[PDB]
Amino acid sequence: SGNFCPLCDKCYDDDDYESKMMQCGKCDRWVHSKCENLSDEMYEILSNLPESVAYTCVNCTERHPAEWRLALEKELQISLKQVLTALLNSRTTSHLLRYRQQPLDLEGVKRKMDQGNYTSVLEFSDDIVKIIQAAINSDGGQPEIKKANSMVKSFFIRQMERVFPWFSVKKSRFWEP
Amino acid sequence: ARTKQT
Ligand SMILES: [Zn+2]
Ligand SMILES: [Zn+2]
Numbered sequence: 257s258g259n260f261c262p263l264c265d266k267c268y269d270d271d272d273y274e275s276k277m278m279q280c281g282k283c284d285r286w287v288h289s290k291c292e293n294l295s296d297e298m299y300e301i302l303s304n305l306p307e308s309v310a311y312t313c314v315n316c317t318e319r320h321p322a323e324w325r326l327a328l329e330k331e332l333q334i335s336l337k338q339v340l341t342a343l344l345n346s347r348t349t350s351h352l353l354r355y356r357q358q359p360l361d362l363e364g365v366k367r368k369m370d371q372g373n374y375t376s377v378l379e380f381s382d383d384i385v386k387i388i389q390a391a392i393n394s395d396g397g398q399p400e401i402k403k404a405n406s407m408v409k410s411f412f413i414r415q416m417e418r419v420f421p422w423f424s425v426k427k428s429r430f431w432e433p
Numbered sequence: 434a435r436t437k438q439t
Binding site: 302 | 434435436437438439
């Protein structure tokens with residue numbers, strides 16, 4: 257009865273846990289992820305925020321923008337930077353820093369990121385996969401360009417698995433056999 | 434943030 261999303265006004269079942277909904281930390285009601293205009297990636301990131309960051313429904317939101325929104329936006333950018341920073345500061349990625357938007361090197365991903373061009377985890381991952389994959393395709397008969405390539409790759413996949421557990425770098429369309 | 438997933 258009282259089980260209806262305030263935004264779309266439609267009913268929801270107390271038992272369908274396959275639904276993508278958030279619970280307001282104030283009144284405990286549920287709201288559809290899609291009704292707050294959130295992509296599945298956003299929903300996953302939210303399901304990852306600290307227990308300290310509660311989702312809050314519109315009417316329970318006192319000051320706008322709702323804090324969960326700014327926190328969400330910051331979380332994605334900070335997490336992306338967290339990963340890139342590690343890639344940049346590694347001794348195994350030195351050869352992918354500079355080529356010698358579709359960035360052909362890490363310094364390029366770096367600029368594309370600082371300018372706020374990444375709005376999803378998928379685009380960021382794909383740009384990096386392409387760079388790593390390009391290096392793998394051209395590291396003919398040579399290690400540390402073959403060896404390093406695989407440890408920046410393993411490094412990338414693992415680093416991403418840590419920050420974005422719900423995301424699959426392995427499935428990227430840009431990997432080659 | 435609590436979700437159906439968490
Ligand atoms: Zn709804
Ligand atoms: Zn509420």
